[PDB]
Every structure is written in structure tokens, then in C-alpha cells.
Amino acid sequence: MALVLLSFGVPRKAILYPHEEPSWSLAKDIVFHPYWMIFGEVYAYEIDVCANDSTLPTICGPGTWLTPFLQAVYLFVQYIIMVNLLIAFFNN
Amino acid sequence: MALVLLSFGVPRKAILYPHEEPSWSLAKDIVFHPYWMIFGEVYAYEIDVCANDSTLPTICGPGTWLTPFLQAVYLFVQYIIMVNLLIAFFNN
Ligand SMILES: CCCCCCCC/C=C/CCCCCCCC(=O)O[C@@H](COC(=O)CCCCCCCCCCCCCCC)COP(=O)([O-])OCC[N+](C)(C)C
Ligand SMILES: CCCCCCCC/C=C/CCCCCCCC(=O)O[C@@H](COC(=O)CCCCCCCCCCCCCCC)COP(=O)([O-])OCC[N+](C)(C)C
Ligand SMILES: CCCCCCCC/C=C/CCCCCCCC(=O)O[C@@H](COC(=O)CCCCCCCCCCCCCCC)COP(=O)([O-])OCC[N+](C)(C)C
Ligand SMILES: CCCCCCCC/C=C/CCCCCCCC(=O)O[C@@H](COC(=O)CCCCCCCCCCCCCCC)COP(=O)([O-])OCC[N+](C)(C)C
Ligand SMILES: CCCCCCCC/C=C\CCCCCCCC(=O)O[C@@H](COC(=O)CCCCCCCCCCCCCCC)COP(=O)([O-])OCC[N+](C)(C)C
Ligand SMILES: CCCCCCCC/C=C\CCCCCCCC(=O)O[C@@H](COC(=O)CCCCCCCCCCCCCCC)COP(=O)([O-])OCC[N+](C)(C)C
Ligand SMILES: C[C@@H]1CC[C@@]2(OC1)O[C@H]1C[C@H]3[C@@H]4CC=C5C[C@@H](OCCC(CO)CO)CC[C@]5(C)[C@H]4CC[C@]3(C)[C@H]1[C@@H]2C
Ligand SMILES: C[C@@H]1CC[C@@]2(OC1)O[C@H]1C[C@H]3[C@@H]4CC=C5C[C@@H](OCCC(CO)CO)CC[C@]5(C)[C@H]4CC[C@]3(C)[C@H]1[C@@H]2C
Ligand code: NA
Ligand code: NA
């Protein structure tokens, strides 16, 4: 699960924040939102940053249309597969 | 589950957005919000678009009172039936 989290977090930050200098905040930002997604927070108004109802209108830029596809895959893997594998692990 | 998603998404968009011209955004809008509903996002202030606390007051129009009934059925089928069938699948 931790690996799936990073496999999503790193591309998301890289696509949405392409003009960043090196900083330890990068370590926070690749792990922070992907973790809270496991616990029922999809960040609904940040998914499509170029939509009218977006809370991140300044992040709208080239390639940002990729991040909803990434997040859709991420949560499928975490909830539909990995959370329920863990339920099945504990039941058995 | 993907079929249940479309069975909800298409009516929702059609009832709430009746004055749309053909566009590929239609493909996004029939699948987008119904998918994020699977992962704990009910879009609480968009359900009844004619309420005072609604975030979509301009969408208020004829027939829009139908969409809460549709969404109530949709989530019953997805969480109460289909998510727990999948848990039962993995356990067994
Ligand atoms: C069942 C329901 C679905 C039906 C499916 C039919 C598919 C039809 C395909 C339609 C694609 C064309 C639509 C957009 C028109 C082109 C220009 C455009 O507006 O681009 C938009 C983004 O989107 C893109 O740039 C490309 C999107 C391609 C992926 C679409 C899904 C492909 C099928 C599934 C793939 C999964 C794998 C499938 C195989 C397993 C621009 O949007 P923006 O982000 O707001 O950018 C503007 C702002 N900016 C200038 C600052 C950036
Ligand atoms: C292997 C399985 C494959 C699954 C199916 C294939 C995948 C789904 C196919 C979808 C069709 C493709 C949509 C193209 C729309 C183009 C419109 C556009 O301008 O850009 C959009 C595309 O950019 C995005 O970022 C949104 C992409 C949709 C993500 C869907 C994730 C949910 C997965 C669902 C999976 C369940 C599937 C259910 C069963 C079918 C973004 O719009 P915008 O940024 O707001 O642009 C400004 C526009 N405005 C000014 C009007 C606001
Ligand atoms: C246990 C607790 C529940 C008790 C049940 C008792 C039921 C009593 C029934 C009451 C119906 C009458 C109430 C509304 C008065 C009529 C006019 C009105 O205000 O309409 C409102 C909408 O609603 C409708 O237009 C019709 C709603 C009908 C469905 C109600 C549920 C029926 C039972 C269950 C059905 C499920 C299946 C059942 C069988 C299995 C207008 O609201 P709006 O959207 O804000 O529109 C105004 C704005 N606009 C002008 C822009 C549009
Ligand atoms: C098979 C099983 C059947 C289940 C029971 C039957 C179903 C439930 C029956 C409900 C009674 C019917 C309500 C009528 C109210 C009319 C009022 C009105 O003006 O319009 C409203 C009706 O329009 C809507 O869109 C809301 C409809 C309620 C959806 C309920 C979904 C939850 C299901 C629950 C299932 C669990 C049931 C629990 C066990 C009983 C909308 O109001 P508005 O748009 O804000 O209008 C402006 C008003 N304002 C100015 C004041 C803001
Ligand atoms: C493997 C398939 C090969 C690829 C082709 C087939 C894929 C679909 C077809 C084509 C791709 C989508 C084309 C539409 C977008 C082009 C327009 C555009 O500029 O869009 C954006 C950039 O977009 C890019 O720069 C394109 C990046 C593509 C990355 C690869 C896609 C993943 C394919 C994996 C597929 C696996 C499916 C799932 C697994 C089953 C927006 O840029 P802009 O905002 O206009 O720029 C202005 C910037 N300025 C304001 C700063 C000046
Ligand atoms: C099958 C039973 C037969 C149907 C009748 C009995 C059903 C129960 C009750 C009654 C039906 C609803 C009547 C109340 C609303 C009327 C007032 C009105 O205008 O409302 C709206 C429109 O509404 C319509 O145009 C009505 C659409 C009905 C669709 C069918 C209902 C589903 C029945 C399935 C039942 C299955 C139960 C679940 C399964 C167990 C609001 O319009 P407006 O905003 O005022 O318009 C102004 C527009 N302007 C501003 C642009 C000018
Ligand atoms: C298997 C995993 C692959 C991914 C990964 O883990 C292992 O690989 C690690 C490499 C790390 C970076 C290395 C060096 C620096 C330079 C530093 O420069 C100070 C700048 C400023 C501070 O404010 C001075 O004022 C800032 C931090 C940064 C960019 C690291 C960020 C985290 C990264 C990307 C880690 C990431 C989580
Ligand atoms: C089993 C499922 C039943 C439902 C469904 O899948 C299979 O059936 C598909 C038919 C599709 C539409 C066909 C043609 C067009 C015309 C095009 O015209 C360019 C306009 C503009 C673009 O910006 C030019 O500038 C826009 C797209 C649109 C309306 C399609 C939308 C998606 C639809 C509704 C699909 C839907 C998900
Ligand atoms: Na939740
Ligand atoms: Na939640």
C-alpha cells in the first residue's frame, strides 16, 4: 500500500507542480494527500484543476488532465483491491 | 459496477444539464462524479440543487427534484450491495 501511494504521489506532484525548486516540502507533498485518500477524502474540488468549480485554478496547466486518471487508478487499487485484501486477510 | 455507474451518470447529467450541445465533456460528466461517489464523496451540497445551501443554484430547474432519488438508489446499489459483494467475494 505504501508503494502504491508513492507510485501515485510522485507523478501527481510532478505534473501539477512543474516549477519547483528542491525542498523538503516535496517529501511532504508526495505522501500527504495520497495518504488521506485512503481514509475517505478524495479532495473532490482539486481533482480536475481546470474545472470551473476547482479550488486550484492557478494549477491549471499543460498535462493536468492526466491527474484524474491517475487518482481514479490509485483509489481503485487502494480501496477495491488493497483494503479488501486486508479485510480478507483479517477474516481468514 | 461500471454499468450501475453509467445507469446513474447519464440520467443525472441529462436532467440537470438539458441545454447542452455535443461535446466530449459529456463523456467526462457522466462518469466523473458517479465514480468519486464510490470512494466516500456524496457531493452533499450538490444533491438537491434547489435547496438554500446548494452550491449549484443556477442548475435549479424542472425535474431536478429527481436526482436525489437517483443518487440514493445509486449508492445503495454500490455500497450496500456491490462493495459488500466484493468483500464477500474476496473473503471466500
Ligand atoms: C464511458 C464514458 C467515456 C467514453 C470514452 C470516450 C473517449 C473519447 C476521447 C476524447 C478525447 C478528446 C476530448 C478533448 C478534446 C481535445 C482537447 C481538449 O479539450 O483537451 C482537454 C483535456 O483532454 C486532453 O487533452 C485529452 C484527453 C484524452 C483522454 C480521453 C479518454 C480516452 C479514453 C479512455 C482512456 C483510458 C484508457 C482506455 C483503454 C482501456 C483540455 O482540458 P483541460 O484540462 O481543461 O485543458 C484546458 C486548460 N489548459 C489549456 C490550461 C490545459
Ligand atoms: C479500463 C477501463 C476504462 C474505463 C472507461 C474510460 C475512462 C473514462 C473516460 C472518460 C472520457 C474522457 C473525457 C474527455 C473530456 C474532455 C473535456 C475537456 O475539456 O477536458 C476534460 C478531460 O480532462 C480531465 O482531466 C478529466 C478526465 C476524466 C477522468 C475520469 C476519471 C474517472 C474514471 C471513470 C472510470 C469508470 C468508467 C465507467 C465505465 C465506462 C477536463 O475538463 P476541464 O479540465 O474541466 O476542462 C475545462 C472545461 N470546462 C470549461 C467546461 C469546465
Ligand atoms: C418516511 C419519510 C417519507 C414520507 C413519504 C411521504 C411522501 C409524500 C409525498 C409528497 C409529494 C408532494 C411534496 C411537494 C409538493 C408539490 C410541489 C413541490 O413543491 O414540488 C417540489 C419537488 O417535488 C415534486 O415536484 C414532487 C415530489 C414527489 C415525490 C415525493 C416522494 C413520494 C413517495 C416516495 C417515492 C419513492 C417510492 C415509494 C414507493 C416504494 C418542488 O421542489 P424543488 O425541486 O425545489 O422545485 C422548486 C424549484 N423549481 C421551480 C426551479 C423546480
Ligand atoms: C422503497 C423504499 C422507500 C423509502 C422511503 C421513501 C423515500 C423518501 C421520501 C421522502 C419524502 C418526499 C419529500 C418531498 C419533499 C417536497 C419538498 C420540496 O419542496 O421539494 C423537495 C423534494 O425534492 C427533492 O429533490 C428531495 C427529495 C428527497 C430525496 C430523499 C433521498 C433519500 C432517500 C431516503 C430513503 C430512506 C427512507 C427511510 C425509511 C422511510 C426538495 O426541496 P428543495 O429542492 O430544497 O425545494 C426548495 C425548498 N426550500 C425553499 C425550503 C429550500
Ligand atoms: C500509449 C499511447 C500513446 C499516446 C497516444 C494515445 C493516447 C491518447 C491520445 C493522445 C494523447 C492526448 C493528446 C491530447 C492533448 C494534446 C493537446 C495538449 O496540449 O494537451 C495538453 C498537453 O499535452 C501534452 O503535452 C501531451 C502529453 C501526452 C502524454 C502521453 C499520454 C499517455 C498515453 C497512455 C495511454 C494508456 C491508456 C491506459 C492503459 C490501457 C495541454 O497543453 P496546453 O495547456 O494546450 O499547453 C499550453 C501551455 N502553456 C499555456 C504554458 C503555453
Ligand atoms: C409510475 C408512477 C406514475 C407517475 C406519477 C406518480 C409518481 C409520483 C408523483 C408524481 C409525479 C410528479 C408530479 C409532481 C411534479 C409536478 C410539478 C412540476 O412542474 O414539477 C417539476 C417538473 O415535473 C415534471 O415535469 C413531472 C415529471 C414526472 C416524471 C415521472 C415521475 C417518475 C414516476 C416513477 C414512480 C416510481 C416510484 C419508485 C419505484 C417503486 C418542476 O417543474 P417547474 O420547475 O415548476 O417548471 C418550471 C420550468 N421553467 C421555470 C423553465 C418554466
Ligand atoms: C524509494 C524512494 C524514492 C523517492 C524518494 O524516497 C525514496 O527519494 C528521496 C530523494 C529525496 C530528495 C533528496 C534531496 C533533496 C534536496 C534537499 O535540498 C534542500 C533544499 C532546501 C530545503 O528547504 C534548503 O533550504 C531538499 C529535499 C530533497 C529534494 C529530497 C526530497 C525527497 C526525496 C525526493 C525522496 C523521495 C521520497
Ligand atoms: C454503452 C455506452 C452508451 C453511452 C456511450 O458509451 C457507450 O455512448 C457514446 C456515444 C458518445 C457521443 C458520440 C458522439 C459525440 C459527438 C462529439 O462531437 C464533437 C463536439 C465538439 C467537441 O468539443 C467539437 O468541437 C462529442 C462527443 C459525443 C457527444 C459523444 C459523447 C459520449 C457518448 C455519449 C458515449 C457514451 C459514454
Ligand atoms: Na468515507
Ligand atoms: Na468521506
Side-chain angles (χ1 to χ4, degrees):
Chain A
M1 291 178 75
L3 185 157
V4 172
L5 190 152
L6 293 169
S7 304
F8 173 54
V10 172
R12 180 183 188 272
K13 181 67 180 177
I15 293 166
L16 296 173
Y17 293 91
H19 295 97
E20 293 295 323
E21 295 295 327
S23 65
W24 293 104
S25 67
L26 293 174
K28 183 256 183 71
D29 291 329
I30 58 170
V31 72
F32 189 76
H33 287 171
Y35 187 76
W36 303 115
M37 285 178 194
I38 296 163
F39 301 104
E41 181 57 26
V42 301
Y43 291 94
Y45 294 104
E46 299 179 355
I47 302 167
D48 189 359
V49 299
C50 290
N52 295 118
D53 62 355
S54 176
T55 57
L56 296 173
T58 58
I59 303 302
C60 183
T64 59
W65 63 268
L66 287 162
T67 56
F69 293 104
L70 297 177
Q71 190 180 343
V73 175
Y74 174 61
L75 290 178
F76 187 86
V77 176
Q78 295 292 79
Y79 286 5
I80 304 300
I81 300 168
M82 291 307 296
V83 164
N84 293 325
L85 181 64
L86 192 60
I87 294 165
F89 178 67
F90 294 171
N91 299 126
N92 288 107
Chain B
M1 291 178 75
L3 185 158
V4 172
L5 190 152
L6 293 169
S7 304
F8 173 54
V10 172
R12 180 183 188 272
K13 181 67 180 177
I15 293 166
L16 296 173
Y17 293 91
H19 295 97
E20 293 295 323
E21 295 295 327
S23 65
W24 293 104
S25 67
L26 293 174
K28 183 256 183 71
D29 291 328
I30 58 170
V31 72
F32 189 76
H33 287 171
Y35 187 76
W36 303 115
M37 285 178 194
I38 296 163
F39 301 104
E41 181 57 26
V42 301
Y43 292 94
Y45 294 104
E46 299 179 355
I47 302 168
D48 189 359
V49 299
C50 290
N52 295 118
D53 62 354
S54 176
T55 57
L56 296 173
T58 58
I59 303 302
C60 183
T64 59
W65 63 268
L66 287 162
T67 56
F69 293 104
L70 297 177
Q71 190 180 343
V73 175
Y74 174 61
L75 290 178
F76 187 86
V77 176
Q78 295 292 79
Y79 286 5
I80 304 299
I81 300 168
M82 291 307 296
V83 164
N84 293 325
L85 181 64
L86 192 60
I87 294 165
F89 178 67
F90 294 171
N91 299 126
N92 288 107

